[PDB]
Nucleic acid binder design. Structure first.
Lengths: 37, 82, 63, 104, 206, 63, 143, 127
RNA sequence: CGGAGCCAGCGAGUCUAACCUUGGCCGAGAGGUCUUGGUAAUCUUGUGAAACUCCGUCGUGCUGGGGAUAGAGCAUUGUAAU
């Protein structure tokens, strides 16, 4: 269940951070998993 | 005389080596007995993201043993905050 | 039916230059299970000579 | 092993519990032929009857057939407990039944 | 043969078998008879591998595959079936049993039986399916001797896998029967017959 | 059976519809004076040895 | 040049030591040996119906002499079988703990295995002596 | 101190570290004899770095092998490569250079895997 | 099928909670009991995985291949398992 911005479509439900794959790639440059290979 | 182990972790190698080398220089310039910077394996935390792609993260770890009184340990722990 | 299956083993094995697991069932008298019992029995007697032994196939030689 | 040879004396097809049994397979897999009896059931019955199960069903005396039938109508008296039987904890009687072949 | 006794005893059978110049447990690679001159350069096994089980990377170059040991290459094409993918040790023991059988079936040189079955079951010429203008005829091409080795090993493994399936007779006995009936042309094996079929289609279609 | 022994001397390229067959110039092994043009299915490098059956057959081109 | 378990083959050691335990008979052997298969990942009980328990104990004692200590779950992991689930593929299934407990109580009652304060079944020095002696006798079978 | 050479030998994440000291002529792999390798088929493969040179090269040395990782075939190739490497390293560092060249020539002419590490790794699966 | 041998690596793990669990006893098992270790290259973990190796049972017979379907009970998570 999306507890951030009501965005259930594509939750990343792993580890309870629970961001949708749209907004996960919005906030991808705040955590640190970025493009290496 | 307290024996304290400092376990340092970082994502980038240059600042972590700088912090470790500053610990070595300052604990060497006033005669503290110590173990050298033990360099743990860099753990590679990865996520397979939707063919498929891979997101990576390198995490580097050192630890340094020190034997020092309370004043020197507190001043070292306060100043080395970066 | 004991004396008209068993001794044909004792005629055929010295005839055949090569005696193994399934070149001894082929005589169409016996099953494939008791054939290996007859193999070990001829090992003990001496008409069968061991070449190599595996749990699924065992190579022998006449005497 | 030792080739133990028998001058006839074996029957081709036996009949037990009103059902034909082929007297050429192992006794486990010859008593598996009848209904209500599988592999491990005939195996444990003939181990309680101490039957040599590497012997075929043609080399089996009818006294051991009587022992097997006695374990059929008495499974729970011969140290084969309730987990091993067909109809455990019934509703009609509250007992444990092993439903046999032609009695279904 | 001047034994050297160690504290960990390397046993007497192994010291006798590999101190004396026999290049297997019972066999030798010094006795290898190749008939065809084209098959001299593509069968070559002269290095004594006492198990005939190697982690070969022979499949990167087309010429390197010819330097795969043909005992090992036959062992590799034994590992063809879907139940057997990734089972080379099984086929090595199959080869060891088979060489034992070819010993006991009065062929003192079973490796020469293998090489002669390679030679006598290779279709020299075959047909390809040319365009031909609609009604596609088949034209006799003269297949390469490396492909003749490939083709003979493929036909032998296919015939042995056909014969050993759905019978009591083992893979080693069927494969030994095929190698003995195919080491000298007898038309009771598989690859002799199919070699003859491919060559008669080639001769009919040149 | 006439077993023609042959020598690859000159490769001509890759032909066939599928691009699989090879035109090969052949020095005949028993008699040097014969130079044949043959069609080979399979991998062939220079100075290889072939086993033909007819030295006299020559095919112009393929499709 | 010590004659010990480390020099003999695996199955030969298990056969010999199980034969010595059968001819001795001085262990704790239960009554559900003819009833109970060694693991839930099996269809049939073991074929050595009067003597698979001694084979089990020989495997256990050999597995204990070679290492520091064992448990019950470790020997459940060791025996583990690829179990068919009908239409589903095979999966790893550990064995029963009761066979492990009764084997270790049978070999601890005779004074061969013993509980070590790391919570583990280790080989006793009398058990070390006995297994090395019967391994020496297994080597003397080969002369 | 007993003169010993410590030398690795690797095969497919299977590392067998070998300790070739001056001993009785004793060979152990994981505290188990070289007579007893866990596959029966690959057994003579472990004998391939042994009989390719000879057996009087071994009476002077007690040989240790301790293994981590791998499979069944991988550990066999690891231990035979480690035996060859420890043997030629003993005959390099303590024994003269020429005998080391003879042992390395005997190993190289038959199987270069026994002296040179392998490369057939599983690739990264190309995302 | 019945025994034996027992070979890896990527991960992942609990706080203001019940995560990963070692071990010991009970139970045919499912599982249960009692604890203990690990917030982690430390404990689980050497994850003793499976395929594999060997030896015995089977003997080509919809067979001892198959396991779909169905009956009976027993346990586990979940308020509630039809």
């Amino acid at each position: 269940q999306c507890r951030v911005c009501s965005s259930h479509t594509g939750l990343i439900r792993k580890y309870g951070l629970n961001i949708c794959r749209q907004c996960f790639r919005e906030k991808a440059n705040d955590i640190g998993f970025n493009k290496f290979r | 005389i307290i024996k304290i182990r400092i376990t340092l972790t970082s994502t980038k190698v240059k600042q972590l080596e700088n912090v470790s080398s500053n610990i070595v220089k300052n604990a060497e310039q006033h005669n503290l007995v110590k173990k050298g910077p033990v360099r743990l394996p860099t753990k590679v935390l990865k996520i397979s993201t939707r063919t498929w792609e891979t997101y990576e993260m390198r995490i580097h770890k050192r630890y340094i043993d020190l034997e020092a009184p309370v004043q020197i340990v507190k001043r070292i722990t306060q100043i080395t905050i970066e | 039916l004991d004396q008209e299956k068993y001794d044909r083993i004792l005629k055929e094995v010295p005839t055949y230059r090569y005696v193994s697991v399934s070149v001894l069932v082929d005589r169409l008298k016996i099953g494939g299970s008791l054939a290996r019992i007859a193999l070990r029995h001829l090992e003990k007697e001496g008409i069968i000579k061991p070449i190599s032994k595996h749990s699924k196939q065992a190579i022998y030689t006449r005497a | 092993s030792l080739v133990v040879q028998e001058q006839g004396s074996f029957q081709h097809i036996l009949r037990l519990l009103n059902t034909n049994v082929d007297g050429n397979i192992k006794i486990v897999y010859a008593l598996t032929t009848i209904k209500g009896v599988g592999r491990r059931y005939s195996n444990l019955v003939c181990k309680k009857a101490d039957v040599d199960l590497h012997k075929r069903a043609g080399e089996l005396t009818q006294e051991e057939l009587e022992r097997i039938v006695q374990i059929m109508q008495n499974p729970t008296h011969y140290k084969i407990p309730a987990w091993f039987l067909n109809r455990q904890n019934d509703i009609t009687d509250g007992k444990d039944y092993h439903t046999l072949a032609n009695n279904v | 043969f001047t034994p050297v006794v160690l504290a960990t005893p390397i046993p007497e059978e192994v010291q006798q078998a590999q101190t004396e110049i026999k290049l297997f447990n019972k066999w030798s690679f010094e006795e290898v008879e190749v008939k065809d001159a084209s098959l001299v350069d593509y069968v070559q096994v002269r290095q004594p591998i006492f198990v005939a089980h190697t982690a070969g990377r022979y499949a990167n170059k087309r010429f390197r595959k010819a330097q795969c040991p043909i005992i090992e290459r036959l062992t590799n094409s034994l590992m063809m079936n879907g139940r057997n993918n990734g089972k080379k040790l099984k086929a090595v023991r199959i080869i060891k049993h088979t060489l034992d059988i070819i010993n006991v079936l009065t062929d003192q040189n079973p490796i020469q039986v293998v090489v002669d079955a390679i030679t006598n079951t290779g279709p020299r010429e075959d047909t390809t399916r040319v365009g031909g203008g609609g009604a596609a005829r088949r034209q006799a091409v003269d297949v390469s001797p490396l492909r003749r080795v490939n083709q003979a090993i493929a036909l032998l493994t296919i015939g042995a896998r056909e014969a050993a399936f759905r019978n009591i007779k083992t893979i080693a006995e069927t494969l030994a029967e095929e190698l003995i009936n195919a080491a000298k042309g007898s038309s009771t094996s598989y690859a002799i017959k199919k070699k003859d079929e491919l060559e008669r289609v080639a001769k009919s279609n040149r | 059976t006439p077993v023609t022994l042959a020598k690859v001397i000159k490769v001509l390229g890759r032909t066939g519809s599928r691009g699989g067959v090879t035109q090969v110039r052949v020095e005949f092994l028993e008699d040097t004076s014969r130079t044949i043009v043959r069609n080979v299915k399979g991998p062939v490098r220079e100075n290889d040895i072939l086993v033909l059956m007819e030295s006299e057959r020559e095919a112009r081109r393929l499709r | 040049p010590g004659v010990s378990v480390r020099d003999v083959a695996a199955q030969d050691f298990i056969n010999a030591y199980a034969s010595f335990l059968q001819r001795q008979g001085k262990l704790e052997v239960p009554g559900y040996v003819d009833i109970v298969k060694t693991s839930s990942g099996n269809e049939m009980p073991p074929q050595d119906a009067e003597g698979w328990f001694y084979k089990r104990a020989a495997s256990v004692a050999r597995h204990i002499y070679m290492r520091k200590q064992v448990g019950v779950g470790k020997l459940n992991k060791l025996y583990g079988g690829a179990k068919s689930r009908g239409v589903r593929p095979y999966k790893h299934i550990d064995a029963s703990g009761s066979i492990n407990r009764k084997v270790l109580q049978a070999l601890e009652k005779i004074g061969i295995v013993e509980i070590s304060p790391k919570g583990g079944r280790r080989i006793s020095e009398n058990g070390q002596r006995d297994l090395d002696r019967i391994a020496a006798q297994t080597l003397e079978e080969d002369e | 101190a007993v003169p010993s050479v410590q030398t690795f030998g690797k095969k497919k994440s299977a590392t067998a570290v070998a300790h070739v000291k001056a001993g009785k002529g004793l060979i152990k792999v994981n505290g188990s004899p070289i007579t007893l390798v866990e596959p029966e088929i690959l057994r003579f493969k472990v004998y391939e770095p042994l009989l390719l040179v000879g057996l009087d090269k071994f009476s002077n040395i007690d040989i240790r092998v301790r293994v981590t990782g791998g499979g069944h075939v991988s550990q066999v190739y690891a231990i035979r490569q480690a035996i060859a490497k420890g043997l030629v390293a003993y005959h390099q560092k303590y024994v003269d250079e020429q005998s080391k060249n003879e042992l390395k020539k005997a190993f190289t002419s038959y199987d270069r895997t026994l002296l040179i590490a392998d490369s057939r790794r599983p690739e990264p699966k190309k995302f």
